Structure formats: C-alpha cells, structure tokens
Amino acid sequence: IENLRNIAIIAHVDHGKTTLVDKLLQQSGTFDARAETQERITILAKNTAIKWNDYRINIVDTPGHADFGGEVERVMSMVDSVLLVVDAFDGPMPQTRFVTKKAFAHGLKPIVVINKVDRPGARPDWVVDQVFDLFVNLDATDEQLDFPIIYASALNGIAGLDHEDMAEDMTPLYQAIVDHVPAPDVDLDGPLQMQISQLDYNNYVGVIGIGRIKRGKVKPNQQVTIIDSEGKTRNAKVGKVLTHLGLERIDSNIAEAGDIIAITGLGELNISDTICDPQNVEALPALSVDEPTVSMFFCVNTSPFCGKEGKFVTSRQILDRLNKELVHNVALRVEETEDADAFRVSGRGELHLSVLIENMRREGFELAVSRPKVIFREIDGRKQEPYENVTLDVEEQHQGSVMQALGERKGDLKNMNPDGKGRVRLDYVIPSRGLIGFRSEFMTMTSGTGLLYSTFSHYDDIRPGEVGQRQNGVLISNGQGKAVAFALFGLQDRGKLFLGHGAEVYEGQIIGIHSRSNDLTVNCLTGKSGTDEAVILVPPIKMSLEQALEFIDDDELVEVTPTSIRIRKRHLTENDRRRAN
Ligand code: NA
Ligand code: NA
C-alpha cells in the first residue's frame, strides 16, 4: 500500500513522453511483453505500471481530446500527483495548459521533467522560469509552487536534479516520484468499494471497467452489488480482475485498495458506477461524465439516386455498422426510433458525428443525416438543455471578436486570465446548443491560432432564442434529370450554385443558396433588341461534409455517399413542403 505511487503524465505531443515512459520501464527491469529495442503505437497505454525496487508506479496517460475534459478530471481524481514533461528548448506550450489547470484544480502537487536537456540549443534554466510563470498563472498554492525538477535525456538514459552534473542513469526520476508523490490514501481492511473511472472493450471479454479501488479487496467470481450515481442498484459476479504490469494487463487472483485495475464480467458498467461488497452498498460521489450533447438522425438514403454510388445502404447494414462503432467508441450513443430506417446517434460534439460519417462513406455506405442539434430533456417537470464549461485559449488580438461571438451564442463569461505573454484564457458556461457550429467559426476568427476546450457541466432551464439562424433561403429543383447551362446561367443571377452543367438532379434536391431569405422551387432542366453574350457559369460551391451539416436547416437532409455530397428537402415536392409550412 505505502509502496504504490499513482501519477498522471502531461506532455505536448512532440515532447517525448512515450520515449520517457519507455526508458523508465526498461531501466526498472519490469518484464516487457512487446518487442521494441531502440527507435530512431507512438502513444502511451492508458496505464503503464513500473516496478522499481520495492515500489510500484502507475503512470496514467492524460487524455488529449479537447471535448473530453470530463475524462481528464476522472484521471486526476484517481491519481495523487502529476508528471508535467516539458522540452528543454520549447519550454511548456499552451496545448497542455488546459490539462495542467485540471491537475492544480484537483489540488495535485506537480513533478516537472525537463527532457531533451542534451539536444542542440537546450535552455533548461529559461524553461524553469517559463514553468514557474505558468503555475503562478494557474493560481498555484505555495505547496504546488514548491516542486521538484528532474532534468532528463531518454536518448542517453540519464536524469538529474542538476543538468550540469547528471547521474549515470534514471535513478533520480524514480526517487523524485517515490519521495514527493504520496501513497494512495485508502482503507485496505474495509468492505470492497471501487468506482468505474474509464471504460474499454475487447472481443475476448467484452466491457472492461477501469478504476482505483477506494477500499477493500476484489477477486475473480466475487459477488458484488453495483450502484450508479442515480442510486439504482444491481447484483453481479466479477469475472476477471486485471492488474497492470508494464504495458500489459495480468489475470490476477486478487487486487487491493490503492491499486488501479481493470475488471470484467460485470455487464454494461457506466462511468461513476461503484462496485460494492453486497453488505455495504456505498456509492462514491458522481464523476464528471463526457455526456453526448449533440445528436443527428442517421437515416437510410431514400433519394431517387439511392444505391447508385455506394455498396452498403440497407437499414440493417447501417445499424450493424453503428452498433459495431458503439462498442469501440464508448462516448457515442445509438438509439432506435419509431422509424426503423432512422437511428438517433449522439456524441461529444458534431466533429464526433462527422468523423463517424466520413469513416462510413469511405467503407462504401450511403445515408441521409439531419442537422446536429441537442436533445431537450424533461427533468423535474420542465424542459432543460445541456450546458457546457468551455475554455478558449487565444492570442490577445482575438479576445474582442471571440467574446462578441460567444455572447451572441448565449455564452456566460466566468473568467478572463491573460498570461502577459500574448495569450488569454476565457472560461464560459454555454448551452451545448450554442456551441454547435462554433468550433469552425472559432478557427477562422483566430486564423487557426486558438484552442477550444469543452467539459459537460449540467442540464438547466432552456435559455431563450434560437442560435445560428441561417439568413439565406435555398434553390430547390422541381424536376429530375440533367441540369443545363442555360438554366444555371439564369439562376446564378439569383443566388450561388452547388453544381454545374451535366449534374444529375432530382426533385427536392437543393442546388443553390438563394440571395433572399425565402426558398424558391426552380427549373434547372430546360432553358427559359440586345441580350447577354456568353453562357459561362461561375465555379460551383463544393461543400465539405462539415459545411453541408452546418448549412442545413430542420426541414433538410444531407444525402451522403462515398463519392458525393447532396443537400435535399425532407419533403421532395413543393406540394408536400406547402402542407407542412
Ligand atoms: Na453511474
Ligand atoms: Na458539445
């Protein structure tokens, strides 16, 4: 127990945290199940367990996805310190600030590694000053400002407290971890209490629960009572108890409090479930969950062009592909609707849904999707919507316009923190519904220089007024067939077009953006003293999947194939659109 060290690791993508975890594992003589010697997946295991002398160090990877601040909090709630790894030349970079801020907010003391100290142009002393300023900028406590520094060269396999007189090996980094990281604070003799912090899956056993055992012990085939954060309970039987050794999970006959473990055979475990000894059912506090706040309908493509471009089109081919994603994509949610050729798919931001669709197009799928929107849930008698905690890290020159746009998106400002080094951090509380479409506008407005983070917060009363109302109406084909130059030449005078001469269109397909706010049903199949000389079309607007989804309204769909992106009305005929209004 007193010999366990549970630490999380933080590093910019190119600052060699994988290289460092590898050197620490090799020099510790921990049995290595893989087969790499010296290089010259390059990402970490979610947990790496190092055996050094009579000490066990669990290194938990810090999630790098910007919309999963929930998961970052769960990592910090499970560990007792953080290892911040920083390059000897770049110094700390703004990409790791969000996760560093979470570590300090959960009251963790940091251990700083300045690695690549022998690379050309290294300036470790300057990196120390940069790290000190960051922590002060993060409102560090006096205990958080009193932190060890270990200089390191994974290349030469050496570490030290002093970069000018480095030791023969990595001994100093290990010693810094056991000296300054407290052992887990846990009750070994009380009844089993273990919270699910992370979920994983493999075809050999199914759902895998990952967590730090808060109290007691757990064995294979043990009878447990699982309790969720809604207080509902269910009895179950532990299948396998898996301990961590290097990059691998080990079938173990027991596991004790303080230890970070994988558990199986407990069916559909959810984040924050507490596995309990059946006599003493005690739920631990609810953990932040990465709630799927944006939803789209994934429908069978019913267009007159259906089946002509992709191999996979049926309702079961699509459902089979979705359930197949669901097991490997634990944040995602697939639901059946009253329509059997329509499936409500929910995920962490529209990007999560758009990536899935792009995967299915490449595979040969064909489908229609509705716009990304939130699910309005009735809780405590009223209609509430999801709200998010949002962090924006921007160059100071972008502060003005970023704030105006977030205000317009119903964003409540909560904090402004400039670093005095050309960047500012803005914390907002905004309904998820006001965040849809923003990441794209945010990149354009900040010229790709900004960083945006998201952590699900809560449901609350609906904030009044619609967000991102499209101002322009659309041009809708009233026929099926080949679009012609002479007719497109006349319509491009009334709006911008999505296609040119020779495109096959169908009735209700959207073929352009109208200059005015109203929709027009137009003819693009036949052509209507002086005249207009030359029939030349301005190049069509060819939208990405992301643009089609941010373009479409509630009465429209994006028809998707492996080779094509089409926009369409739900009601393909003008008569049908009139009978809805
Ligand atoms: Na739960
Ligand atoms: Na969201």
Q: Please give the residue range of the domain that contains residue 164.
A: 4-180
Q: How far is the CA of 270 from the centre of ligand 1 (A)?
A: 5
Residues 430, 448, single domain; the answer is yes
**Is 17 marked as binding a ligand?**
yes
Residues 175, 26, single domain; the answer is yes
Residues 135, 42, single domain; the answer is yes
**Is 14 marked as binding a ligand?**
yes
Q: How far is the CA of 447 from the centre of ligand 2 (A)?
A: 22
Residues 146, 31, single domain; the answer is yes
**Is 19 marked as binding a ligand?**
yes
Residues 361, 388, single domain; the answer is no
Whether residue 215 contacts residue 186, with contact meaning beta carbons closer than 8 Å, is answered with yes
Residue 121: give its domain's CATH number.
Answer: 3.40.50.300
Residues 174, 118, single domain; the answer is yes
**Residue 398 placed within a domain:** yes
**Is 6 marked as binding a ligand?**
no
Q: Per the structure, how many domains does the chain have? A: 4
Question: Beta strands 81-87 and 109-115: pairing type?
Answer: parallel
Burial class (CB in 10 A: 0-12, 13-18, 19+), 143: exposed
Q: How far is the CA of 203 from the centre of ligand 1 (A)?
A: 23
Cα–Cα distance, 7 to 27 (Å, whole number): 18
Whether residue 550 contacts residue 467, with contact meaning beta carbons closer than 8 Å, is answered with no
**Is 116 marked as binding a ligand?**
yes
The H or E element spanning position 423 is: strand 423-431
Q: Where are the alpha helices (DSSP H) in 122-183?
A: 124-137, 142-145, 171-180
Q: How far is the CA of 292 from the centre of ligand 1 (A)?
A: 15
Residue 333: give its domain's CATH number.
Answer: 3.30.70.870
Q: How far is the CA of 14 from the centre of ligand 1 (A)?
A: 35
Longest Cα pair distance anywhere in the chain, in angstroms? Answer: 100
Ligand nearest to the CA of 289: 1
Q: How far is the CA of 433 from the centre of ligand 2 (A)?
A: 7
From 438, 461, 484, give the residue that closes a domain: 461
From 401, 434, 461, give the residue that closes a domain: 461
From 461, 493, 510, give the residue that closes a domain: 461
Alpha carbon separation from 493 to 363, 469, 568 (Å, rounded):
39, 24, 21
Alpha carbon separation from 135 to 78, 92, 308, 397 (Å, rounded):
22, 11, 58, 23
**Residue 119 placed within a domain:** yes
CA angle (439 as vertex; 354, 136 as ends), nearest 5 = 130
Q: How far is the CA of 325 from the centre of ligand 1 (A)?
A: 21
**Is 563 marked as binding a ligand?**
no
Residues 26, 141, single domain; the answer is yes
Cα–Cα distance, 274 to 214 (Å, whole number): 10
Residues 6 or more apart in contact with residue 461 via CB below 8 angstroms = 382, 384
Residues 306, 393, single domain; the answer is no
**Residue 447 placed within a domain:** yes
Cα–Cα distance, 267 to 237 (Å, whole number): 9
Residues 305, 259, single domain; the answer is no
Token duo for residue 250? 């080990």
**Residue 549 placed within a domain:** no
Residues 406, 451, single domain; the answer is yes
Residues 368, 387, single domain; the answer is no
